[PDB]
Ligand SMILES: Nc1nc2c(ncn2[C@@H]2O[C@H](COP(=O)(O)O)[C@@H](O)[C@H]2O)c(=O)[nH]1
């Protein structure tokens with residue numbers, strides 16, 4: 622329903638990916654171009670293009686993204702050392718794929734949140 | 739775990755200017771803003787790190803994000819865009835041990851991860 626991105630094909634197993642977790646609400650898969658030793662994308666199974674499009678009924682799935690992140694971080698061996706979760710929205714955020722998603726990043730000291738400040 | 743200063747802010751035990759508060763989440767401006775919009779969105783319950791979340795927290799965690807969308811719209815940054823960031827433990831650079839999202843926006847934010855080396 623509505624404009625699907627390549628992430629729709631990934632969740633619905635219509636194109637190859639490395640899925641590390643999937644339930645009725647979320648799917649998590651390794652990033653094709655990892656920016657840290659662990660770089661995993663966590664996405665809701667429904668098509669919400671940007672964070673601007675979220676609604677109350679999505680809250681359980683949005684929360685599931687974060688509990689799944691914690692589960693995966695532990696599996697990956699990065700939970701104790703630490704990690705960052707990032708959601709990018711629109712131009713200023715640098716969003717490239719218009720299906721909301723969280724990046725789980727870890728495996729080394731990740732430095733400042735933003736370049737310079 | 740012990741409560742941080744965020745708990746005193748949430749329960750209005752010290753002066754503050756709260757941007758948003760409901761049953762589950764509280765939002766306010768960062769003391770040291772890193773972007774023209776820099777707002778923290780925090781669950782009302784103390785959860786020290788993201789490692790400590792569980793199923794019972796999912797509603798509140800989801801609420802963080804729907805509240806972020808509301809605040810981004812109010813701030814005039816929703817169209818241009820913004821980032822939401824949660825930092826956990828050392829490698830993430832967490833300083834305050836009560837989980838929270840940073841809503842950052844109001845200008846192009848640059849690389850998602852600036853420092854990929856030292
Ligand atoms: N696994 C996988 N990752 C993808 C694919 N296409 C884009 N990506 C990843 O999706 C992410 C998009 O993040 P954004 O810049 O929108 O926050 C990028 O890190 C990019 O590497 C794909 O087909 N498969």
Ligand SMILES: Nc1nc2c(ncn2[C@@H]2O[C@H](COP(=O)(O)O)[C@@H](O)[C@H]2O)c(=O)[nH]1
Nearest residue numbers: 743766767768769770825831832833834835
């Ligand atoms: N408004 C406000 N922000 C604070 C206070 N103490 C710490 N902060 C902010 O809390 C944030 C902690 O984020 P962390 O480093 O844990 O991801 C920092 O950006 C810091 O500037 C405070 O008393 N008031």
